[PDB]
């Protein structure tokens, strides 16, 4: 493959440019095209950043891009390296997210972090080095889930009904940090995701057994605990011997239901790109296994 990529700069880089570009060695930067030679405009997310179009659009563009690790900069050349599956690399988190050991990491567009400064880097003319966020899986599928629930809830609601609920949904709290999702528009892509959610939920409701349906009621008759209280409360405002006992029916239905559940899960789950096992005690870099 094109194991190395040359990025050439058209703007002459000052002393400060070369310095700050050197400090960024091992940062994860994406390229759209996977070519041996590219120009600095194609580097990063700045080619696509567009706040009138939503967060989901930039998410869709990013999840299809090719990701690279920055290496030594020389005169007007930056030398990006593509990681390969199963090997071990040192990666840099320019994002404000905390990494704990053993985390599985995903790539997402940046979110709004409180201070609003966000450290603009390499503003050459009116180009800018907009790097993505390398986020651990829990926060990644939390943002994907909240974004889907905003799309699914706020349809056919007016702005007055919507306002407080989506204000509460946009804010995510993760490891004592606080982030906000920038532009959650109701895209065409988001409507496709919502349609897949509806079909998968219909198949869950249709093909579920009677055991899988009625377990909770029987446990509530048998048992009482805080978890069961919460589960009952979710069903409350809408709220016997089996007449068929069929292990083959149960196996057929369950092997189909797991398929539908994986379909519904893929709307929330992102692709793991790195897995960490060593974290610098200042949380500025990690040792990672590259995955794809």
């Amino acid at each position: 493959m094109e194991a190395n990529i040359f990025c050439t700069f058209d703007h002459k880089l000052s002393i400060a440019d070369v310095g700050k570009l050197t400090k960024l060695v091992a940062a994860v930067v994406p390229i759209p095209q996977r070519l041996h030679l590219i120009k600095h405009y194609q580097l990063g997310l700045h080619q696509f950043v567009d706040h009138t179009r939503g967060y989901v659009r930039l998410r869709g563009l990013l999840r299809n891009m090719t990701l690279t690790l920055m290496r030594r900069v020389e005169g007007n050349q930056i030398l990006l390296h593509v990681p390969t599956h199963g090997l071990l690399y040192t990666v840099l988190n320019t994002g404000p997210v905390t990494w704990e050991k053993g985390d599985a990491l995903c790539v997402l567009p940046p979110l709004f972090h409180g201070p609003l400064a966000r450290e603009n880097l390499l503003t050459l003319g009116q180009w800018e080095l907009v790097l993505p966020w390398i986020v651990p899986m829990p926060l990644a599928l939390e943002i994907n889930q909240r974004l889907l629930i905003m799309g699914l809830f706020s349809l056919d609601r007016s702005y007055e009904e919507v306002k407080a609920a989506v204000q509460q949904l946009q804010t995510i709290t993760f490891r004592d940090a606080t982030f906000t999702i920038p532009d959650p528009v109701i895209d065409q892509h988001l409507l496709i995701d919502m349609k897949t959610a509806c079909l998968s939920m219909s198949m869950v409701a249709n093909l579920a057994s009677e055991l899988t349906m009625t377990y909770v009621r029987k446990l509530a008759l048998e048992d009482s605990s805080m978890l069961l209280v919460k589960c009952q409360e979710l069903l409350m405002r809408l709220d016997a011997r089996p007449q068929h006992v069929s292990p083959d029916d149960e196996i057929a239905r369950l092997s189909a239901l797991f398929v539908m559940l994986r379909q519904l899960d893929d709307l929330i789950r992102e692709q793991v790109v790195f897995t960490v096992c060593d974290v610098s005690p200042d949380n500025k870099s990690a040792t990672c296994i590259f995955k794809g």
């Binding site: 009138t52 349809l155 702005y159 306002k163 532009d183 109701i186 409507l191």
Partner: protein, 471 residues
């Protein structure tokens, strides 16, 4: 085609709770234009009974039956009246076919079978397929019921038609492995196609009837008494009269103020005037203009466009804030030194609407927007064109103007800027009548718009007949 099928199933799954029967409609160039067909965002429908009562409101009566208030503090009911109105409209599914078609060939090229009584082709530049529900409040359907159709566009503009259930059911009621509902719906097909007008005979649309509909199974009853149609016609008369009674209220107010003052008009608008002029012919031109304004006033008069932003939900709260702001106590020295700086008051320029009536070649302009500000030297008004240019019609002897300020103060101005000044009184209109006739549409979220409010929405949705559709 699929919208009719889905909507039939949807109204069946909801029938016990709602008792709304599914009415399948097709619209073409006889009801809407190509741009309006391509850019249509919502279709909403409303049910009103033989007594003029909407089915979203309380079955016996409402607190909106009381007269209006004339108070900006009340704003003709405020948020609660607005919410009672919004609850009254129900949203319908719709699909646009934006390229020229012939309806029967389109249905046959789909899965349907068509066995009409006479095979007359109907051709249409574009088609909108939508399903409305008319409410049989029991297993009984009256001919005096009317149904309202509303078409809405992305800027929030709407268009209302209304037709009574007698026109729709004039013929249809006067005559009265395992299978899937989809295949038998297609196989059973269509056998009726009827053209229906609205009450005022402005717009024609076609009704499509299917033999597989759950409508057929119910064997519910239909009736039309004479007295019920009479009362429904009277309610309709009261409905359309709402803007004209306001116009007459303003006319009587002008004549009453003119009697009270004795014909002495003080100057309220800036214009250098001469004594050596035949002011009597100006009075005669004023007579002709005030007759002609009544001759040509309409729904798009300045008075309706002035009351319409009052009916919006934010209006009452904002008016109360303004009342607090103007009557706020003078700040103490401590607040000026240490505390925050005071709110900026009202901007020097206001937005007004006017009716400009020229006599020489009889013409009246109605929905005219002007910007108004008081000149510093003398506190008279300067009326400017919304591009910032001074309006010249104060200097033309053959034109009079009626302005209505955003707080429902009206001026009637003669050449020279001598004006009659009084307030539009809403007390002749029940709160519900104004409120249902002229409340602005507020949008629910849809494809291609921000979840956050106030954002600059991106490229607006469109279905294109001129381009190969994107997917």
């Amino acid at each position: 085609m699929e919208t009719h099928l889905y909507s039939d199933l949807a109204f069946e799954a909801r029938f016990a709770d709602d008792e709304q029967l599914p009415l399948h409609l097709v619209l073409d160039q006889e009801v809407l234009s190509n741009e309006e067909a391509e850019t249509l965002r919502y279709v909403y429908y409303r049910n009103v009974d033989s007594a003029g009562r909407s089915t979203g409101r309380a079955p016996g009566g409402d607190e909106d039956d009381a007269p209006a208030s004339d108070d900006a503090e009340d704003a003709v009911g405020g948020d609660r009246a607005f919410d009672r109105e919004r609850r009254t409209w129900q949203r319908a599914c719709f699909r646009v076919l934006p390229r020229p078609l012939e309806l029967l060939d389109y249905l046959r090229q789909s899965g349907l079978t068509v066995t009409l009584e006479k095979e007359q082709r109907v051709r249409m530049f574009y088609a909108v397929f939508t399903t409305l529900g008319l409410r049989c409040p029991d297993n009984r359907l009256s001919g005096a019921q009317t149904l309202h159709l509303r078409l809405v566009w992305p800027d929030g503009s709407y268009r209302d038609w209304e037709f009574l259930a007698r026109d729709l059911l004039r013929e249809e009621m006067e005559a009265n492995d395992e299978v899937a509902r989809t295949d038998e719906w297609k196989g059973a097909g269509v056998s009726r196609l009827r053209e229906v007008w609205d009450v005022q005979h402005r717009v024609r649309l076609r009704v499509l009837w299917y033999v597989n509909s759950f409508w057929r199974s119910r064997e519910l009853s239909y009736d039309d008494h004479e007295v019920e149609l009479y009362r429904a016609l009277d309610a309709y008369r009261a409905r359309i009269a709402v803007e004209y009674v306001l116009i007459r209220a303003v006319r009587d107010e002008i004549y009453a103020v003119l009697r009270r003052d004795g014909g002495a008009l003080p100057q309220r608008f800036a214009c250098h005037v001469s004594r050596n002029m035949s002011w009597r012919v100006v009075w005669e031109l004023c007579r002709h203009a005030l007759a002609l304004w009544m001759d040509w006033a309409d729904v798009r008069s300045c008075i309706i466009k002035a009351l319409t932003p009052r009916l919006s939900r934010g209006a009452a709260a904002a008016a109360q804030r303004a009342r607090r702001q103007r009557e706020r106590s003078a700040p103490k020295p401590q607040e000026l030194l240490f505390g925050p700086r005071n709110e900026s008051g009202p901007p020097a320029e206001q937005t007004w609407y006017a009716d400009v009536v020229r006599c020489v070649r009889a013409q009246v302009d109605l929905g005219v927007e002007v910007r108004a500000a008081r000149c510093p030297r003398t506190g008279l008004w300067i009326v400017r064109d919304r591009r910032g240019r001074l309006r010249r019609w104060l200097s033309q002897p053959e034109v009079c103007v009626l302005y209505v300020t955003p707080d429902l103060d009206f001026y009637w101005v003669l050449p020279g800027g001598f004006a009659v000044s009084s307030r539009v009184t809403l007390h002749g209109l029940a709160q519900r009548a104004l409120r249902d006739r002229f409340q602005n549409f507020e949008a629910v979220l849809a494809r291609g718009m921000h979840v956050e409010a106030g954002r600059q929405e991106p490229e607006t949705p469109r279905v294109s007949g001129r381009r190969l559709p994107f997917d």
